[PDB]
Design an enzyme around this catalytic site. Sequence first.
Site, PDB file in Angstrom:
ATOM      1  CG  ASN A 105      33.784   8.050  18.136  1.00  0.00           C
ATOM      2  OD1 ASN A 105      34.712   8.470  17.434  1.00  0.00           O
ATOM      3  ND2 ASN A 105      33.978   7.227  19.161  1.00  0.00           N
ATOM      4  CD  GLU A 140      36.238  10.647  19.241  1.00  0.00           C
ATOM      5  OE1 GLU A 140      37.168  10.145  18.578  1.00  0.00           O
ATOM      6  OE2 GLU A 140      35.535  11.599  18.819  1.00  0.00           O
ATOM      7  CG  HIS A 175      41.756  10.142  14.908  1.00  0.00           C
ATOM      8  ND1 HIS A 175      41.197   9.845  16.133  1.00  0.00           N
ATOM      9  CD2 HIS A 175      41.030  11.170  14.404  1.00  0.00           C
ATOM     10  CE1 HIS A 175      40.181  10.658  16.361  1.00  0.00           C
ATOM     11  NE2 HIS A 175      40.057  11.470  15.327  1.00  0.00           N
ATOM     12  CD  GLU A 184      34.288  10.337  14.598  1.00  0.00           C
ATOM     13  OE1 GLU A 184      34.596  11.386  13.998  1.00  0.00           O
ATOM     14  OE2 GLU A 184      33.562  10.317  15.612  1.00  0.00           O
ATOM     15  CE1 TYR A 200      32.158  13.031  18.958  1.00  0.00           C
ATOM     16  CE2 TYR A 200      32.303  14.565  20.810  1.00  0.00           C
ATOM     17  CZ  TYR A 200      32.891  13.617  19.982  1.00  0.00           C
ATOM     18  OH  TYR A 200      34.203  13.253  20.174  1.00  0.00           O
ATOM     19  NE  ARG A 202      39.369   5.772  20.115  1.00  0.00           N
ATOM     20  CZ  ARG A 202      38.902   6.734  19.322  1.00  0.00           C
ATOM     21  NH1 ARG A 202      38.443   7.866  19.837  1.00  0.00           N
ATOM     22  NH2 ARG A 202      38.908   6.569  18.003  1.00  0.00           N
TER      23      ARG A 202
END
Length: 447
Positions: free
Chosen positions: A293, A353, A119, A164, A295, A75
């Site tokens: 995504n 991600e 991005h 995002e 985290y 990606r």
Amino acid sequence: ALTFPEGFLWGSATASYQIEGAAAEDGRTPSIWDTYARTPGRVRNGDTGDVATDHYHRWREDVALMAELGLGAYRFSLAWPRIQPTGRGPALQKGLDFYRRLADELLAKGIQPVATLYHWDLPQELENAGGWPERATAERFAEYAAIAADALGDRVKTWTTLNEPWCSAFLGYGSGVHAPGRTDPVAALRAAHHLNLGHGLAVQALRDRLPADAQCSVTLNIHHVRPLTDSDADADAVRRIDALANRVFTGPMLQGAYPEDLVKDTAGLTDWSFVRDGDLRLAHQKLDFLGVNYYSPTLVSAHSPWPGADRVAFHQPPGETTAMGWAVDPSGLYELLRRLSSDFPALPLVITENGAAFHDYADPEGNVNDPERIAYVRDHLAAVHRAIKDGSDVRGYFLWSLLDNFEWAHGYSKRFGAVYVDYPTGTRIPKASARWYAEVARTGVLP
Ligand SMILES: [Hg+2]
Ligand SMILES: [Hg+2]
Ligand SMILES: [Hg+2]
């Protein structure tokens, strides 16, 4: 040992400005991040992506590194500034040539290329004209997408419009901690809408110009919001943040309407008159899968990234922390996946991600040991597998990132790579996690 589904995609991810370098080569013009980074005080130690990992020149070696790691997909993002300098005008073939060669090399190696059109590296000229808060930017993004589709459509079959947009709109125009660095709540909400509009117009253009078997998508950093206590007020807080972090995008993109509560929560700030009739229908395009995504979770109870939610206050979620100081909580990913499965049952999910930053270092013997990253990824892959067991339709996982790189406002102080990068020389040193992850991508088994 857990086994993942037949056909599960194993890849790694990167972003153009974060790894490419060659910021002023082959026709590329400055993006908002070039401007932002060269602005005193904006990025740690004044770091910029001028050279980064020098992927622009080392692209061949990097693809070969992907092959040695047995990855099935890669990606990456396309630099708008390279493909169409200034954000308007004709395509620049030399810019497109870099991605043609890259995509072709990936395919030659049996690695599926997955491209993200946007991005964060917005051409500075579009910002000079108003940026995302300005409607024209959406139309310009659509033209860019058509240009990209027309040139790379025959080699790249999986596309992502935006990556995002929450960070782009709210950190970029709300709190200003990201390029272009502006601070205005309404500007931030206009940016969000125009990102929604741009996405739609882009998918329309992709649908129209790409082969009938190409896959179109959007990558959203879905904030998994939890309340500090059981209080009823804390539940209201969760709703507010969920609407601002996720539904302001999933609403228009996947349902064709902004959530009413969001409109209500922001009534003191704006009336959303910049949402022109038909904009919501355009933003609502059919997607082949949703890119997620993740985290860390969120714990809750003029210059912030949450316009209209000043009554609220955030807290450090429990769990050990990474170099970013972000809580490590696999459960957040499991719950998040189940929520998505419940809200969008028919929408296939792909983890575009996931990763962690730790203070890695190359020792005297040349080794870079990152057992903490191996643990983080393994723990999150287990949550993913668990979500799959319970019914969630997850088809892939992209480790962020293949290479340590320019982590935006943090500069190069944060290393997320599976491969260590000695910045002065550009030398790549595969970390222990790279070797471990390679085994997972080859067996499909998680020890
Ligand atoms: Hg962000
Ligand atoms: Hg498509
Ligand atoms: Hg956030």
